[PDB]
Every structure is written in structure tokens, then in C-alpha cells.
A paper describes a structure:
The structure of [name] is atypical with a very large catalytic chamber, called ‘crypt', formed by two joining N- and C-terminal domains. The zinc ion is located in the N-terminal domain, but key residues forming the hydrolytic site are located in both domains, resulting in constitution of the catalytic site only in the closed state. [name] has two substrate binding sites, one at the catalytic cleft and the other at the exosite that is distal away from the catalytic cleft. All of these results are consistent with the recognized role of [name] as major protease acting in the degradation of insulin and Aβ.
To substantiate our understanding of SAR, we used X-ray crystallography to determine the structure of compound 1-bound hIDE and examine the binding mode of compound 1. hIDE consists of two 50 kDa homologous N- and C-terminal domains ([name]-N and [name]-C). Compound 1 forms close contact with the catalytic site formed by both [name]-N and [name]-C of [name]. The hydroxamate tightly chelates the zinc ion at [name]-N. The fluorinated group of [name] also forms a π-bond with Phe820 at [name]-C. In addition, the triazole interacts with the positively charged guanidinium of Arg824 at [name]-C. This is consistent with the high affinity of triazole for cations. Interestingly, the naphthyl side chain has some conformational freedom within a hydrophobic pocket formed in the C-terminal domain of the catalytic site. The relative freedom of the naphthyl chain in the binding pocket is consistent with limited loss of potency observed when inversing the chiral centre of 1 and explains the discontinuous electron density. The hydrophobic contacts of the naphthyl group with F820 and F834 residues are also consistent with the observed reduction in affinity when it is replaced by the phenyl group. The F-atom in compound 1 forms key hydrogen bonds with S816 and E817 but the methyl group in compound 10 does not. The 1, 4-triazole moiety allows compound 1 to complement well with the catalytic pocket of [name], whereas 1,5-triazole makes compound 16 more compact (distance from the branching β carbon to F of compound 16 is ∼1 Å less than that of compound 1) (9.2 Å versus 10.1 Å). As it binds to the catalytic site formed by [name]-N and [name]-C, compound 1 appears to inhibit [name] by keeping the enzyme in a closed, inhibited conformation. The closed conformation is observed in the co-crystal structure with 1 and its existence in solution is strongly suggested by the SAXS experiment.
Numbering used by the authors: 43 to 968, 980 to 1011
Write the structure that this text describes.
């Protein structure tokens, strides 16, 4: 009945468990829309996906569509204030982000449910009347450059662009998508191009209503949501832009049967096998790509990976279809290489073609397709409820590909087995259509080519016909069998009825010396799933570097063993996580409760009776060595956070102390360690979900019983159960720790102002203050000053202590960033005194909403509880108490907090700074005016540093 609405979609198919309400519709201008009504959501959300990406970039301005995406946040004609959008969301419990792919640019936000319209209106202007301020463009060009700079020494990006560079140079697929200062500023200036106009023009030419999809989620009715969205988005202009397509494959025969030898930054060994294939998106209802990927990428018994692992050539394998763009795709088989595998690359690839041959001989298996269909059906029915911001964004993306009534189910539900399509794709998987890339340090100095954008050192060879012919003649290897029927597929979806004595929070229902068991029956979600969380305490886990290493190798060897067995369970919605910690071991099993007890016993039982294979020990141990070394190639700001963690923690083995001790880890020594580790334990657990109290106690009983039976485990004392402390900085102190990043040519810095031990008061001062300066900090340090792409502020919580932290990755020297952060703090001081009481109450409200936002899924709630448990604070009612206190804070309260704890001349300022110098930088100790800074005490040695200071107390439990 509305002229602006071309059609209103029918019943939108959803899971019976989904209580959200849906109406799909298509606007007169062509915008596809999905309206989502959820009366309980504390945060509303919307997203818009344009069906243009960097593949549509002008060939002379690489990264333009990406740059466009940055600029839309920087002002519209209706809301011309540069950070009006960001500031609004921040003051209303909201957030926003975006991304640019080959074919899509995706924008999304969430906000307090009370302010959907205000946010939605400002959001809409991106597509109505963007400003593209000349000043803003010249600044933000730097943020894009920074973002690229961060990727240059990253192995994943280097390889990503290299494949693009080794195909047809005239194909859009070869374009550089990110852009940098050269492509965006330097070269355009040479050519005389007005980049601001090219931005305006690109938005004008491609950001058309016929290529847009919109999703909006709020508390409002589907009716009110309809009027709101139509009111705002029917005014979007339709230029009837043809949807871009790329029918010709980027890989022609000149690019097939080619071998590439590549040199990585990190010490890694990879083999990448690629086949060009047709666009399989139209066959989505049968999805031939996923069927083949599922088998080739199978990790269970009989699989290709199983064989390659037995010969000790590979450890992990990825197989399946890989996105390209409209018109083309790829099929890939990727493995990591052992030192041995690197020598048998030709043989590995033969094995791949033998398995593929095994599939041709067997023919398509309908029961396999039928199994994938069945698993996905269950997956969609009992799908966890998504957080709004990610939901609207994801759906906005696939609205382009599917009918309105089917968007929710399209990517889950399979219709009909099409063996013809399977044979079609399988026919492309031949030696004559293969591309091979080997990534190894062993090719260093032996390369002759250099990729233009990342500087990747590589070498190109043609695969000799002698080798190609060998691969085409692939005899059936007897080691290869099709996967067996997945026996972990859940059958019992019964939701057990809430017990009479069921608690709203976890209740302590068992307290022996052996174990402490926390339990809660789910009363919010009612899906047939449960989370089993176990912390195993033992002093021998982190007593020294040698033992810390062995704790790690033990679990890694344990998982390496269970993989083939647990893989089926993972496919069937039943996963486990097993990590070594500073307190001992951490075990988490999550998923459908049905066959969950089966898996859990297998782990605990495997744990306590583990027999170590020597070959796996050698391989896994060597990988760990490279793993520790590879930390040198991490980002400067990641180093910054790592170094600070070491400085401020009572005990912390550095990655150097670890890799040194590793040389002393032997098989005999490790075999001895495991039993010693399991001989003494204390188990603390949280069982949460679709389980009864007796089933919970039964579960706990089985873990203890299995340990005692196989490992002869015994309890640990209460006094032995004290956690580590945080170093306590002196009043008016300032320490600086300086290191260099050998790989990246950006500097990193973390600045930590340590306030005080955690408590309701200190928590809310810090959080309310962080809330107030969150947006302004991003706007000043990045948007205005453009110090870096990565600019972060917020609370730091470790060992029961807390403080305010700033993190920045930049091309400027760390000492420069210091004055700028300090300059900002003085700036913020004035802004808060000038702040109106109403603006202040907005921040109190924004923080309050964020804290009280309820978990949409079980594991989110489980995390909340488990956080209170491992922190041994046990404050399960924390949010209500702290939000209550928050609302009683004064603007004067925050000013005093700042002046006492954080201000430059503050009495109780405890400041430590970590400086990470860029690769080619050098040493130096020490716009809005930056204050004078005292001379810092330069930390020369972490041990001396810790020993010379007090340690905080630990927070007492509830
Ligand atoms: O790079 C991108 C995505 C990103 C880059 C980014 C975004 C946030 C980051 C946060 C911490 C460290 C690093 C970050 C890098 N992007 C965001 C925007 C708009 N900014 C906000 O909405 C915004 C965020 C936070 C605030 F407090 C206030 C406002 N434009 N591009 N697209 O190409
Ligand atoms: Zn970006």
C-alpha cells in the first residue's frame, strides 16, 4: 500500500528457536531490506552492504573504494561535524566499523535501543550527502597508509597479493586493494588528478540503490521499523548500476602448471596448491564445492591428511573451494611442511592426486551429501542467537545473493544431491590445471623476482612435463579411505526441565580437596547444548621455563593424538579446547550435550594415560622452537603489550628463557614430567547449560575417578592456591622500558597509568573515565593528528589491579607519541570541566547500557561466570552492583579522580611506558601544547625492576 515499497516479502523462514521477528521487503529504488524485531535487545543495529568493492577501483587509483569507506565516517552535509557520527554512537552505548572486499563494502553499527532512529538517520547520510572535506581527505590518507604499512611485513598479506600478481596483469583480480600514500596521494599528484573529486565521483557512480542491501534490528515493531527505514532509505538515488562481473579467469594457461618459490618473513614452511574453477555460486543449493572440500580437507581416518601426517610430511591441511569473484573461483589444498615434507614436495602433491583419484574411482556418495545436509539442518535449528551488530552486517551481505524469504536458511540448508556437478568440479582438479607455491626460508638468496606492493622475494618456474605426467598417472593408494559415518551426530535434543532448586547464578555444589564444582542449569537459552569448563591446578606447570615448555608440549602432543578422533565430533557441533596455563591446565568442552560425556572421558582418559610417539615429539618440538622465534615478526604494538605484561607480573618467563630451556627438553624427561604433573591436582570447574545437578556431579565424578584410576592423582592444599601479583608502581614514578622490533619499520608504544586495586569504586571511576575519553582519544590522536592507524585507549586489568592504558602503532618515534598522549590528557581535562551535566549523564548512561547488556548465547554467559571464577573474585552479581554505584558518580568525582591519579602533576600517578622502536630507528629518552615530563627511570633489567618494587595484594573473593 506504499509507493516507496516495490514488494513486501512473505514469511521469512527462520529457526523455530529464533524468537526474533522478521519482515523482508524491497524498496522502489531497489534496496533489498530485512527488518528484524526483537523487543528484548538492549542494543539496536543496522547495516548496509554495497555490492561494489576494490575490484571496481580505477586502475590508476588503487584502493579508492577502500579510501571512500574511511571518508564516509568523516562528515555528511546534514551532520557536517567531522566526528559527529562517532561521537553520537559513543554517547549511546554504540560502536561502528566497516570493510571493503573485492565485491563488497559493508557498513554497520549498534547503539542503545532507545536511540536507533538518531543513529540510523546519521548513518543514512553516508549514502545521501557525504562531505569529503578536503582537510579530512589529506589527513585520513595517512590512516590508510599506516594500515598498509602494518601489513607489509605480514606473511598472509604478502602471499595474498602475490597470487594476485602472478595472474593476468590485465585482470581486475591483480589490483592492489588496500592502497597507500603513493597510490592515493603521491601518484595522483604527479598525474594532476583531484583525488577528492574521484572519491565523490566513485560514490556517485557506484553507490546506487540498486546495488544496496539494508538490515535493521531494533525493539520496535516490524511495522514501525518499516516506516522508519522507508522514510530514510527510499530517498537513496538509483543510478541503475550494472552489477560487475568477471567471466574470464585470472589464471590462463600461461599461469597454469607453474611453480613459485617464496621467501617468508617468519620461519614457516608452507605448500599451496591451487586449481582454477568456474563460479560455483549458482549451484549453492547442492554446493558441490563444500562436498569435495569436506572430503579432501577431512582430518579423520583414511583421509589425505592422515596419510601425510603418518609419513611425517605435514601437520595441518586445508582443502576446499575458495572465493574469487562473480565469474571465477579457486579450489585449494594447503599444508604446512615438516623439515622432511619440504624435501618431498613432489611426493606430497602426488599423494594429493592419488586421493583425488580415489574419489573419481568411488564416485559421488549420496550418504555423505545427506550427512552434510542433516548436520547443517541441526546447526541452523539450534543456532546460537547472534549479537545484533554482527548479525545485521552478515545478513546485509548475503541479501544480494538470495531471495528474501530464504536469506536466513540459504547458507545452511541443502536441497538435492547433484553428482553431475561434483564430477564437473572434480574434473578441474588435475595436474594440468595446477599452480604450486612453496614458502620457505630455504629459498632465501635464490629468488629473482620481487612483488611490487609488498616486496615479496620469489621465483617462478614451469612445472616440468616429467613431473606433470607423473601426477596424471596416480595409482590408487591403499592408505586412502572415504570417511566413516559420523558417529558423534547428536540425536537427543531434549531440553531437560528446570529443577526446583535451580539457581540464577552458578552455585557451588561440591567442595572437596580434590575438586570444586560450580553449576548452573541454563534458564535463558534452552538449546540442547552445554559448556564444561575445567581448570586443573598444579605447581609443576609453571615452576620454571623447562616445565612451562613441557606442559605446553604435553598438551600439544595430546591434541595431535586425539585429532583424528575429535575431528568428527567437531564437525558434529562438539568441540574441546585444551591449553596449558600459568596455573596448570585448562580444558573446555562445548556444544550439544548429547554425546558430550563421551568426548570428555576420552580426553581425561587419554590425558592420564598418554603414550608419546617419538616422531610426533620431534616434529611438534621443532615447530614450537620456530613458534617462539617467530615472535620477532609480530607487530610493534603487540610487542609493547607483551613486554608490559612481563614487567607488571610477579612471575613471567620470557620467550627467550623458554626457547633456551627448550633445548633441554628430552623425550625421557617429558615422559617423566607428565606423571609428576598429574600426581597432584586441584580441579575447579564450571558446568553450565542443558544439564541437571546430578548429571553435573556425575560428570565431575568421572573426571576425578578417571584421573585417580590412571594417574593416581591427589589433592592440593588451600594455601598452595595463591595467584600471582601485580608490580606496584611508586607515587609520581615513571619507568620506561625500551626494545627494538627487528622486522617492522613502525614503532609501537603502550602507556599504562596504574590507578589501584579493583573494587566497585575504582572500577567505575576508571570505566566512566575511559568511556568519556574513548571517542575523543581516537578523534584526537588518529583522526586529527594521524599518529597511526592503530590508536587505542581503555582500562587494563591484570592480577586484580587496573589502570588506564594507551596503545599506539606509528611511524613517529615513541618519545614523540608520549608528549602527544600527554598533550591529549591536558586537553581532556578542560573538556570535562566544560562538559555540561547532561553530556556527563549521557556517558553514565552509555556505560550503564554496555555493562548491563545481556548475553545472547550460552557461552557468552559461561564466559561471564568463568571470568569471576578464574579471577577468584567470584562476583556473579557484579554488573547490577557496579552499575548502581556508577549512577551516583559526579562530574566533580571524575575530575578529582583525574587530578589525583592521572594528571601530569598528580600525587599518585603511577606510570610505566613501553617503547618499541621501528626496525631502522634509534634511542632517545624524552598543535595542542605538550606538558613538561620528568626524567624517566629507564628499566635496564626486568628482574632488577621487579625486585626493587612492592607487590599488590590479591583481590579477596566474595
Ligand atoms: O580500517 C578500517 C576499519 C577502521 C580502522 C580502525 C577502527 C577502530 C580502531 C579501534 C582501535 C584500534 C584501531 C582501530 C582501527 N575504521 C574505523 C573507522 C571509523 N572509526 C570509528 O567508528 C570509531 C572507532 C573507535 C572509537 F573510539 C570512535 C570511533 N574508519 N575506519 N577500514 O578500512
Ligand atoms: Zn582501512
Amino acid at each position: 500500500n506504499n509507493p516507496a515499497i516495490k514488494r513486501i516479502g512473505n514469511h521469512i523462514t527462520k529457526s523455530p528457536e529464533d524468537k526474533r521477528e522478521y519482515r523482508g521487503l524491497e524498496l522502489a529504488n531497489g534496496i533489498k531490506v530485512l527488518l528484524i524485531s526483537d523487543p528484548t535487545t538492549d542494543k539496536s543495529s543496522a547495516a548496509l552492504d554495497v555490492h561494489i568493492g576494490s575490484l571496481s577501483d580505477p586502475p590508476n587509483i588503487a584502493g579508492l573504494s577502500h579510501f571512500l569507506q574511511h571518508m564516509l565516517f568523516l562528515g555528511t552535509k546534514k551532520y557536517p561535524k567531522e566526528n559527529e557520527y562517532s561521537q553520537f554512537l559513543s554517547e549511546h552505548a554504540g560502536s561502528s566499523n566497516a570493510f571493503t572486499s573485492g565485491e563488497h563494502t559493508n557498513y554497520y553499527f549498534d547503539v542503545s535501543h532507545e536511540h536507533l532512529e538518531g543513529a540510523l538517520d546519521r548513518f543514512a547520510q553516508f549514502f545521501l550527502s557525504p562531505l569529503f572535506d578536503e582537510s579530512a581527505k589529506d589527513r585520513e590518507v595517512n590512516a590508510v597508509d599506516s594500515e598498509h604499512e602494518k601489513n607489509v611485513m605480514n606473511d598472509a598479506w604478502r602471499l595474498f597479493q602475490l597470487e594476485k600478481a602472478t595472474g593476468n596483469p590485465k585482470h581486475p583480480f591483480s589490483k592492489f586493494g588496500t592502497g597507500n600514500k603513493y597510490t592515493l596521494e603521491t601518484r595522483p599528484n604527479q598525474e594532476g588528478i583531484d583525488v577528492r573529486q574521484e572519491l565523490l565521483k566513485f560514490h556517485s557512480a557506484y553507490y546506487s540503490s540498486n546495488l544496496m542491501a539494508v538490515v535493521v534490528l531494533g525493539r520496535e515493531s516490524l511495522d514501525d521499523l518499516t516506516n522508519l527505514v522507508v522514510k530514510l532509505f527510499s530517498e537513496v538515488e538509483n543510478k541503475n548500476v550494472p552489477l560487475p562481473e568477471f567471466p574470464e579467469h585470472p589464471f590462463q594457461e600461461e599461469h597454469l602448471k607453474q611453480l613459485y618459490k617464496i621467501v617468508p618473513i617468519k620461519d614457516i614452511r608452507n605448500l599451496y596448491v591451487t586449481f582454477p574453477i568456474p563460479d560455483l555460486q549458482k549451484y549453492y543449493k547442492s554446493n558441490p564445492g563444500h562436498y569435495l572440500g569436506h572430503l579432501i580437507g577431512h582430518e579423520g581416518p583414511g583421509s589425505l591428511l592422515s596419510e601425510l601426517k603418518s609419513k611425517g610430511w605435514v601437520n595441518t591441511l586445508v582443502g576446499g573451494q575458495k572465493e574469487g569473484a562473480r565469474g571465477f573461483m579457486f579450489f585449494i589444498i594447503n599444508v604446512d611442511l615438516t623439515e622432511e615434507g619440504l624435501l618431498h614436495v613432489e611426493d606430497i602433491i602426488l599423494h594429493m592426486f592419488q586421493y583425488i583419484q580415489k574419489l573419481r574411482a568411488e564416485g559421488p556418495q549420496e550418504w555423505v551429501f545427506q550427512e552434510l545436509k542433516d548436520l547443517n539442518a541441526v546447526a541452523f535449528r539450534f543456532k546460537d542467537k547472534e549479537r545484533p551488530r554482527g548479525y545485521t552486517s552478515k545478513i546485509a551481505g548475503i541479501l544480494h545473493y538470495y531471495p528474501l524469504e530464504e536469506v536466513l536458511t540459504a547458507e545452511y540448508l541443502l536441497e538435492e544431491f547433484r553428482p553431475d556437478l561434483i564430477e564437473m568440479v572434480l574434473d578441474k582438479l588435475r595436474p594440468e590445471n595446477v599452480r604450486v607455491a612453496i614458502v620457505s626460508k630455504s629459498f632465501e638468496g635464490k629468488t629473482d623476482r620481487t612483488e611490487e606492493w609488498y616486496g615479496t622475494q620469489y621465483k617462478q618456474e614451469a612445472i616440468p612435463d616429467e613431473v606433470i605426467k607423473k601426477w596424471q598417472n596416480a595409482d590408487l593408494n591403499g592408505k586412502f579411505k572415504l570417511p566413516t559415518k559420523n558417529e558423534f551426530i547428536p540425536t537427543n535434543f531434549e531440553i531437560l526441565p528446570l529443577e526446583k532448586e535451580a539457581t540464577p547464578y552458578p552455585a557451588l555444589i561440591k567442595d572437596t580437596a580434590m575438586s570444586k564444582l560450580w553449576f548452573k542449569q541454563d534458564d535463558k537459552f534452552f538449546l540442547p547444548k552445554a559448556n564444561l569448563n575445567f581448570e586443573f591446578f598444579s605447581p609443576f606447570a609453571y615452576v620454571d621455563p623447562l616445565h612451562s615448555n613441557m606442559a605446553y608440549l604435553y598438551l600439544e602432543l595430546l591434541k595431535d593424538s586425539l585429532n583424528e578422533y575429535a575431528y568428527a565430533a567437531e564437525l558434529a557441533g562438539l568441540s574441546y579446547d585444551l591449553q596449558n596455563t600459568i596455573y596448570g591446565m585448562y580444558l573446555s568442552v562445548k556444544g550439544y550435550n548429547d554425546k558430550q560425556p563421551i568426548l570428555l572421558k576420552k580426553i581425561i582418559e587419554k590425558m592420564a594415560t598418554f603414550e608419546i610417539d617419538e616422531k610426533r615429539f620431534e616434529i611438534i618440538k621443532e615447530a614450537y622452537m620456530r613458534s617462539l622465534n617467530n615472535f620477532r615478526a609480530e607487530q610493534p604494538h603487540q610487542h609493547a603489550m607483551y613486554y608490559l605484561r612481563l614487567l607488571m607480573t610477579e612471575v613471567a618467563w620470557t620467550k627467550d628463557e623458554l626457547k633456551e630451556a627448550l633445548d633441554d627438553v628430552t623425550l625421557p624427561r617429558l615422559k617423566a614430567f607428565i606423571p609428576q604433573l598429574l600426581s597432584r591436582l586441584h580441579i575447579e570447574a564450571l558446568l553450565h547449560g542443558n544439564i541437571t545437578k546430578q548429571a553435573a556431579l556425575g560428570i565431575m565424578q568421572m573426571v576425578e575417578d578417571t584421573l585417580i584410576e590412571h594417574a593416581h592423582t591427589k589433592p592440593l592444599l588451600p594455601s598452595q592456591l595463591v595467584r600471582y601479583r601485580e608490580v606496584q608502581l611508586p607515587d609520581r614514578g615513571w619507568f620506561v622500558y625500551q626494545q627494538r622490533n627487528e622486522v617492522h619499520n613502525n614503532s609501537g608504544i603502550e602507556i599504562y597509568y596504574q590507578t589501584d586495586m579493583q573494587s566497585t569504586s575504582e572500577n567505575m571511576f576508571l570505566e566512566l573515565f575511559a568511556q568519556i575519553i574513548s571517542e575523543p582519544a581516537f578523534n584526537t590522536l588518529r583522526t586529527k593528528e594521524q599518529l597511526g592507524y592503530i590508536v587505542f585507549s581503555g582500562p587494563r586489568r591484570a592480577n586484580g589491579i587496573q589502570g588506564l592504558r594507551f596503545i599506539i602503532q606509528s611511524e613517529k618515534p615513541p618519545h614523540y607519541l608520549e608528549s602527544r598522549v600527554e598533550a591529549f590528557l591536558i586537553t581532556m581535562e578542560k573538556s570535562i570541566e566544560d562538559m555540561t551535566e547532561e553530556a556527563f549523564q549521557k556517558h553514565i548512561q552509555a556505560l550503564a547500557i554496555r555493562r548491563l547488556d545481556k548475553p545472547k548465547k550460552l557461552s557468552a554467559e559461561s564466559a561471564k561466570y568463568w571470568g569471576e571464577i578464574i579471577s577468584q573474585q567470584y562476583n556473579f552479581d557484579r554488573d547490577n552492583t557496579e552499575v548502581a554505584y556508577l549512577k551516583t558518580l559526579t562530574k566533580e568525582d571524575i575530575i578529582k579522580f583525574y587530578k589525583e591519579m592521572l594528571a601530569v602533576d598528580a600525587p599518585r600517578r603511577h606510570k610505566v611506558s613501553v617503547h618499541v622502536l621501528a626496525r631502522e630507528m634509534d634511542s632517545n629518552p624524552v598543535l595542542s601544547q605538550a606538558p613538561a615530563l620528568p626524567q624517566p627511570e629507564v628499566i635496564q633489567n626486568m628482574t632488577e625492576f621487579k625486585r626493587g618494587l612492592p607487590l599488590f595484594p590479591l583481590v579477596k573473593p566474595h
